[PDB]
């Protein structure tokens, strides 16, 4: 009668609430508890039994955890309206266009985290952006972009944040992605966790996303 879910903050701005809402409709007397935490912290939390399921954006390998890829969400570049990158609808924008920009990454919690994921995509292609500043969370990064502080790379679903003179630019590199995983304990076999997984599949089928296994 109590399910504990760990989640990275950005998911609040995307599909997480509609999943929980449909999930609620199937379980009118379940106590649902949500806890914002990083993907590495979710792994430790699952092992200690502090949460039952974790929704994250890193693939942390650990025998005690069963991890499953839900979908490959795209990354976008958040910029101020007047930024030159916002003038490139014609040809579009690649990662190698971003290398000399002031880039705002997040979170500032211990590594590995979302900024490590983003920097790895650069390094995967021999790119190393030299001007990086780490901030607490995605909404702060975006507010700072709007204030004129630089640019940021964010999941496409954070476009629910529509700040004055903030524009989101697509990235052309096919691997400019931020996958979303569900993680549970390796011998998890609960009805509640199965139902949660089916609820995600119902939203995806309705939303037109590719179904996970």
Binding residues for benzoate: 10, 15, 55, 71, 113, 204
Extract the annotated binding site for cis,cis-muconate. Answer: 10, 39, 114
Distance CA 181, CA 183 (A): 6
The phi and psi torsions of 188 (rounded to 5 degrees) equal -80, 130
The residue whose two tokens read 């570049």 is 77
Q: Which of 2, 130, 164, 208 binds a copy of itself (CB under 8 A)?
A: 164
Map residues 127-166 to x or -, x wherever contact with ligand CCU holds by CB under 6 A.
-----------x----------------------------
Structural element, H or E, at residue 152: strand 151-155
Q: Identify which of 9, 20, 174 has the alpha carbon closest to the alpha carbon of residue 94.
A: 174
Map residues 25-64 to x or -, x wherever contact with ligand CCU holds by CB under 6 A.
-------------xx----------------xxx------
Q: Which of 62, 97, 149, 188 binds a copy of itself (CB under 8 A)?
A: 149
Q: Residue 178 pairs with which residues in a beta bridge?
A: 73
Which does residue 38 bind out of a copy of itself, ligand CCU, none, counting CB within 5 to 8 angstroms by kind? ligand CCU
Distance CA 152, CA 150 (A): 7
Which does residue 39 bind out of a copy of itself, ligand CCU, none, counting CB within 5 to 8 angstroms by kind? ligand CCU
User: Per CB under 8 A, does 13 bind a copy of itself?
Assistant: yes
CB 38 within 8 A of CB 8: yes
Distance CA 68, CA 56 (A): 10
Sign of CA dihedral 161, 163, 167, 173: negative
The residue whose two tokens read 């985290």 is 113
Q: Which stretch binds ligand CCU (CB under 6 A): 7-15, 43-51, 96-104, 184-192?
A: 7-15
Least separation, in Å, of the C-beta of 33 and a copy of itself? 10
User: By the criterion CB under 6 A, which residues form the site for ligand CCU?
Assistant: 8-10, 38-39, 56-58, 107, 113-114, 138
């Amino acid at each position: 009668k109590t399910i504990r879910i760990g989640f990275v903050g950005s998911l609040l701005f995307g599909l997480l609430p509609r999943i929980i809402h449909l999930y609620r409709q199937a379980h009118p007397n379940l106590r649902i508890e949500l806890y914002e935490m990083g993907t590495k912290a979710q792994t430790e939390a699952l092992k200690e039994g502090r949460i039952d399921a974790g929704f994250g954006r890193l693939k942390i390998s650990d025998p005690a955890i069963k991890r499953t890829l839900l979908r490959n969400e795209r990354l976008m570049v958040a910029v101020h309206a007047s930024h030159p990158l916002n003038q490139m609808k014609d040809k579009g924008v690649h990662l190698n266009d971003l290398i000399d920009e002031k880039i705002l990454l997040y979170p500032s919690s211990p590594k590995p985290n979302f900024s490590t994921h983003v920097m790895n995509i650069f390094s995967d292609h021999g790119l190393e952006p030299t001007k990086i500043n780490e901030v607490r969370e995605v909404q702060l990064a975006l507010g700072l972009v709007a204030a004129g502080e630089g640019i940021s790379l964010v999941p496409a679903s954070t476009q629910s944040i529509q700040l004055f003179n903030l524009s989101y630019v697509p990235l052309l590199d096919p691997d400019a992605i931020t996958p979303i995983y569900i993680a549970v304990r390796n011998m998890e076999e609960s009805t509640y966790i199965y139902s949660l997984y089916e609820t995600i599949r119902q939203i995806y089928a309705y939303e037109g996303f590719t179904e996970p296994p």
